[PDB]
């Protein structure tokens, strides 16, 4: 074979590919690959942090609705 | 008929460890699934699917007079026929024809 | 078999001893003919003939016993019928040593059905509960299938501390076995007795597994299509359970490389959806319902053919190959937590 | 578990390497010693009368007798730093042990006997078994070696069994006898002139005279004691088809046939033909041809001359 | 003989056999022994996780029962 | 969307061959300057259009 189809894969292969992707995404954007610092990850984690903070506030509000129930006009 | 028949004498082959021996032998006496057979299976499932749909559509008409049954079946018929037609033009080998047929 | 059919239809409408009494002699006669055929048979063609007759004798014998109890047909008749069917098939298999597949399939549906009817007889348990439990037993049976099949085929695994001794590399090798043929009376030797059995154990193992998968396949489709109902409250609960079950079976196929073994798994997953769709259209018939069912019933297999043609010639990155694998585990996890919910066990405990 | 798994995997790659060498030996031995029923078709091929006595040909004087077990050409090196008996892990322990037991021999190979190794070969069993193997030995000799290198003699009372011998050229002269008294007058006058038996080897083959003599004994006459008690002569080899006590008094020259046609004998080395044990054990499964089959083979060979 | 009967056994012998069962089990379904990854382990463990999730939930229901039973009428 | 193909991994079932026979070069043509010329392997020439 040569890698066609849906065969299984290991964790060493999963990060290995993901690294080749980050390096190529940088190449299209900055035209250099020296990558002294890797700003691609940094910008992504900030989004993940934003999503996490929003969900915690949602759980808090959902939990409050069970502690002291109420209702709304319809 | 006069014929030449070759010698069948040859060495024997032995594998002692039970797991390796099972895998080796079991792979030479049977056939594994392959892409060629997969397509034939796919075609067979769609054929079975549509005959069931026309069946339930017919069962409604036997108790209702609306156009629904003819309208719905016509588009399915045209679509299935359209695909079959498109495949017959693209078929190159007998395997493909069995799919198209 | 057709004769046993009309006799069955009669017993289904009349409470007379006619069917059990009149069928018993019919079975005994075919069985007697089968016994002689088996003795006189020597060639492979005879065996095919002998096997067909023997297989036909088990049916009358089975319904005859089932029809033996008096009164309305019900719970006890089923226990007796499937019971002798189970013993007969197993018994036929043990001494015959041929047609391993078809007999094994009969044994499993009988055994599980015997356990199902017995529960309904000894306790007033509902079908809802009685069916959900069969679903769970079959789910764990698939994980057991490759192992259970190892025992019946006679594979043995040696483990001992080297006889409490150091190794002997120059030990005298085992004596090769001599073999002959009826026409080719001149003998030839092929090898050690210990090794020849493996080549035979393996061929036997493949058959037990193929049957075990088929028997289980029938049970999951019959149980699942019975649990889902279009009038029962909370209509969506039993339907979602049918979805994950189908997903699990569909992905599990790629652990099996054999041609008929893999198709039976894939087929088992597709047929469950189709079977539920029909049941959901006939009852509670309506224009939207038939309109919806007709679409699902044609798009679903169509997408399948599409996938089958394109996947073998395209490349996928490791992050995606790793993602499809995890769907299988994600599908298995919800079965037990949901089945108990459908069976109301948690509500039963919360209100003790 | 990871260590166990990797050990099993490394063991199977050695197995493949062993099996490949095994295939080469099957092809090589068959190419020099085919089964008797196939030789008839090969008569016209250049493989006939191919053997040479000139030292380098190690197969000269060798004859195929059947099929059985043999030691492969592989040479195994013992494992370093072997852990003590109480220290061996159970799974890998039996694996290396059984690997060693089975992979040390290869099944179903052609067994052979050399005329250069013994004064005689006593055949003990039922008549059909004894005569069958002898007919096989005769035709194998006749196909691989020319009449300028091999000559044959039979002494028997049951002449109806040795009738087919007439067609073979190796039984010619510049020849079947009814008794030792008759054989003694004609043939022994020539052979008693010189020597006593001496086991040879390939390098020595260049020195021995070209015509080797094969003698078949089927009369049980006590008069044979004169040459037998003198331990034969060089360039001769006797096959006793009767099993008389004078020939049967040496286990190293006795071949025993079981009810199943299996031959048992003392084990001998593949490279030196020396006896390696004093107890008889399994040797080979007998190959044999009928009188009709032998005469058919002889007629095909009778068509050719130098 | 040896290996027959109900003699004693040790903990290293117990894992040794389970290794041979897993390895022979895949040889019947996949026809290869490489075991690059061991899917039989994961598939079995997934069921154990499922059952555990079922046990955890029903214990929670029993805990609920003592906090607010059915007999508190009037 | 541009079809950039990241290299496929060997799946851990074969050793590396350090020097297989080199990949065949490709030819190019011009109508007026009918004399053809060659410039490199197909796998490399495509990336310059891919980028």
Residue numbers in the entry:
A (entry chain B3), E (entry chain B6): 10 to 83
B (entry chain D2): 102 to 202
C (entry chain D1): 152 to 503
D (entry chain C6): 101 to 274, 285 to 416
F (entry chain D3): 303 to 353
Could you pull the original sentences from the published paper?
To further investigate the effect of MycP5 on the entire structure, we analysed MycP5-free M. tuberculosis ESX-5 complexes from the same preparation. These assemblies contained the same EccB5:EccC5:EccD5:EccE5 stoichiometry as the fully assembled complexes. Following 3D reconstruction, we obtained two MycP5-free M. tuberculosis ESX-5 maps that displayed resolution estimates of about 4.5 and about 6.7 Å. The differences were most notable on the periplasmic side, on which the six EccB5 copies showed high flexibility and did not form a stable triangular scaffold in the absence of MycP5. This shows that MycP5 enables the trimerization of the EccB5 dimers in the periplasm. In contrast to the periplasmic domain, the cytosolic and membrane regions of the MycP5-free maps were more similar to those of the MycP5-containing particles. However, the MycP5-free particles displayed an increased heterogeneity that affected the entire complex, which resulted in a slight waving of the membrane region and an increased angle variation between individual protomers. Complexes without MycP5 show disruption of the EccB5 periplasmic assembly and increased flexibility, which highlights the importance of MycP5 for complex integrity. Our MycP5-free M. tuberculosis ESX-5 maps are reminiscent of the hexameric, low-resolution negative-stain structure of ESX-5 from Mycobacterium xenopi, in which the periplasm was similarly disorganized in the absence of MycP55.
Specialized protein transport systems—known as type VII secretion systems (T7SSs)—are central to the virulence of this pathogen, and are also crucial for nutrient and metabolite transport across the mycobacterial cell envelope. Mycobacterium tuberculosis encodes five homologous, but functionally distinct, T7SSs that are designated ESX-1 to ESX-5. These systems translocate a number of effector proteins across the unique and impermeable diderm cell envelope. Here we reconstituted the ESX-5 T7SS of M. tuberculosis H37Rv in M. smegmatis to obtain a structural view of the entire T7SS membrane complex from this human pathogen.
